[PDB]
Design a protein around this nucleic acid. Structure first.
Lengths: 100, 85, 50, 14, 425
RNA sequence: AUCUUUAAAAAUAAGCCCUGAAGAAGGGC
RNA sequence: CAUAAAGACCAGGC
């Protein structure tokens, strides 16, 4: 059965590292790996002035692009789920997981 | 932050001391600096034998067997043999 | 004392569990023994040797 | 106590 | 008799996949200690114990060295060549002592020497976990709060504990949540297994950087020193192995953000990312940030330094309640003194006239000597008057005689006065 | 949908007074 | 040096 894992991130090193960590975990705990595949880098923007009056600074308005991946797994055991439970994932990365 | 203002109010009483004792200035004492450099790093071999994915799931808890074997024998002669020395 | 709690984690369950308060002859009287008593109850293993 | 109590008869020449 | 102690002691044993080879040594040191007291000079004995038939044979042990220190103990090697030539220097020659029974009472020193060995074997495997996870980040579920400490559940009923000064200063707890920590430096404390989990020691912040920054798991950047205040401000020092890599830019991230995430993990924890230098003096100049350092005179032999700051940022160089000078007097390894430029000017004018007056304690002929002291110092008696090549070729004429006069008065002065006052009996 | 030249910087928090030169040490509310 | 409680009732001496 799935668990399905979808991860979102701002930095690419943390998500490449993190997906290497999850795939290495799923390989070691005796299960099979489905994926992972990447998706397009969705850009976004949100104007944050940490200062007074609007645009006398002539600098950027804190724009950023966003990376995200997805990976699946079929027929796991209890060693997999308490293994991923005991695993301390890093911060700054979002985990959109599933189960069933 | 706000208080400690009263010693800056007393800066003239500091100024007569700096006129009397010119070779002394503000000081800062100095503790345990020596093992905070060595415990700042393994650098990497501790999370190679600990290795954030793989070696909390593989090597999780290993004196958990010995502690259940420890008290249960001096418990075991009393709960097993019986109250009826 | 806790020091002989620690070395009575070394000696024994019955090694220093005892202290003397034996029933003796009262002060002044001095005779002989003419009769002893034997009374024992089924459960708890009468000694041998002996 | 520990180790036992036995009834003992004592005979003193009065 | 007993006849049951061996059955119950093969019942306790084989619990960590070694049944008999700890209690071999337990009966060695157990029965070897018993005959020490009954024969009152110096009698060291060893037994050979067998488990099959129940009969135990003890053996006489004598110490083989070259001379006889205290009597009858020494076989005096040439006699050890006769009984068995395979016996050499370093081991004892076996002689039979007549004793064959299970044992006479005592029979009880056995019982709690067994109780001792199971507890120190318990201590051994507890030390084995204390090798396997020091230091990791692991976390556990809160069970009990006994009003100074607290109890955890790290999984498989692995119970831990946290002290009072070992916390952030204002923490709140609910029975059930999970908190992360590094673990720790071992006390037993009583007979058991306790695990003080830390969140205020620097290794918590350090291992949070280790999970947060992946270049620590790649050995790209290298962290050297860490100075903290567990809810206010921290200073941590990084370097890089390759000079092209910026460790500061690697430690900040985008946008904050690594110091922002690890900061929000530890409350209002300010984090100063600072570069480590091989220079002792320049790393303090980096470490005083955000101050603007004017000049630093580094004083050796005491690990002390003096810092002067120009204007405006004096209370930012020292920090509120001395926090910049304290954490900066915790990061580097040299004691710091922060002053003004005018207190530094009065410091040099004080040390100059101080050196002049301590040279008025000596013989001190006319004012030209003090002019030499102001121009060329060389204070504290010229550091045993050993300077090269006419003070590196200063010109007043006076090539040979006057420098031999100041070195003669210098060495004679430090000899007579230093042996008069500094040298003790 | 046939060339766009070796990768990105963060804290804005800690109440009010006395002794002391202290950002050393302690007291009060 | 520390332990043999307290209380009830009866018998006894004068």
């Amino acid at each position: 059965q799935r668990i399905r894992i979808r991860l979102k991130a701002f930095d690419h090193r943390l998500i490449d590292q993190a997906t290497a960590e999850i795939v290495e975990t799923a390989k070691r705990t005796g299960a099979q790996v489905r994926g992972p595949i990447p998706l397009p880098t969705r850009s976004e923007r949100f104007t944050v002035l940490i200062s007074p009056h609007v645009n006398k600074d002539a600098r950027d308005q804190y724009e950023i692009r966003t990376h995200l991946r997805l990976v699946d797994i079929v027929e796991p055991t209890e060693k997999t789920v308490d293994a991923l439970m005991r695993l301390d994932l890093a911060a700054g990365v979002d985990v959109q997981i599933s189960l069933g | 932050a706000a208080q400690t203002r009263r010693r800056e109010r007393r800066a003239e009483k500091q100024a007569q001391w700096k006129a009397a004792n010119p070779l002394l200035v503000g000081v800062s004492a100095k503790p345990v600096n020596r093992p905070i450099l060595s415990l700042n790093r393994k650098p990497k071999s501790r999370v190679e034998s600990a290795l954030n994915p793989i070696a909390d799931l593989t090597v999780a808890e290993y004196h958990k067997q010995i502690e259940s074997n420890l008290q249960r024998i001096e418990r075991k002669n009393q709960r097993t043999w019986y109250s009826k020395p | 004392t806790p020091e002989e709690k620690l070395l009575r984690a070394i000696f024994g369950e019955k090694a220093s569990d005892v202290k003397d308060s034996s029933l003796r002859v009262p002060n002044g009287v001095s005779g002989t023994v003419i009769d002893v008593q034997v009374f024992t109850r089924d459960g708890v293993e009468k000694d041998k040797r002996a | 106590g520990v180790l036992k109590i036995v009834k003992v008869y004592l005979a003193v020449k009065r | 008799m007993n006849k049951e102690i061996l059955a119950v002691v093969e019942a306790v044993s084989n619990e960590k996949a070694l049944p008999r080879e700890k209690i071999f040594e337990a009966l060695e040191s157990a029965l070897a200690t018993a005959t020490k007291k009954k024969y009152e000079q110096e009698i060291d004995v060893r037994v050979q114990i067998d488990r099959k038939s129940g009969d135990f044979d003890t053996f006489r042990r004598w110490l083989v060295v070259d001379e006889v220190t205290q009597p009858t103990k020494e076989i005096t090697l040439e006699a050890a060549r006769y009984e068995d030539e395979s016996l050499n220097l370093g081991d004892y020659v076996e002689d039979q002592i007549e004793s064959v029974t299970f044992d006479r009472i005592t029979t009880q020193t056995a019982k709690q020497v067994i109780v001792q060995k199971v507890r120190e074997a318990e201590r051994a495997m507890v030390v084995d976990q204390f090798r396997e996870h020091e230091g990791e980040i692991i976390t556990g579920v809160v069970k009990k709060v006994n009003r100074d400490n607290i109890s955890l559940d790290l999984g498989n009923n692995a119970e831990a504990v946290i002290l009072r000064e070992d916390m952030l200063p204002r923490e709140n707890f609910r029975p059930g949540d999970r908190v992360r920590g590094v673990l720790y430096s071992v006390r037993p404390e009583a007979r058991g297994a306790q695990l003080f989990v830390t969140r205020s020691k620097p290794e918590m912040l350090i291992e949070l950087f280790r999970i947060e920054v992946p270049e620590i798991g790649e050995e790209v950047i290298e962290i050297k020193a860490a100075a903290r205040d567990p809810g206010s401000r921290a200073k941590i020092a990084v370097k890089t192995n390759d000079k092209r890599i910026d460790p500061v830019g690697a430690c900040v991230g985008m946008r904050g953000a690594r110091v922002q995430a690890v900061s929000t993990e530890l409350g209002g924890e300010r984090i100063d990312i600072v570069l480590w230098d091989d220079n002792p003096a320049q790393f303090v100049i980096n470490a005083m940030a955000p101050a603007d350092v004017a000049s630093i005179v580094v004083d050796e032999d005491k690990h002390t330094m003096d810092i002067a700051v120009e204007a405006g940022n004096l209370a930012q160089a020292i920090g509120r309640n001395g926090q910049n000078v304290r954490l900066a007097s915790q990061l580097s390894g040299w004691e710091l003194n922060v002053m003004t430029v005018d207190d530094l000017q009065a410091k040099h004018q004080a040390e100059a006239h101080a050196a002049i007056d301590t040279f008025t304690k000596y013989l001190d002929i006319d004012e030209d000597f003090a002019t030499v002291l102001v121009e060329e110092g060389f204070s504290t008696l010229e550091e045993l008057a050993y300077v090269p090549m006419k003070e590196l070729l200063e010109i007043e004429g006076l090539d040979e005689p006057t420098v031999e006069a100041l070195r003669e008065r210098a060495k004679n002065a430090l000899a007579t006065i230093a042996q008069a006052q500094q040298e003790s009996l």
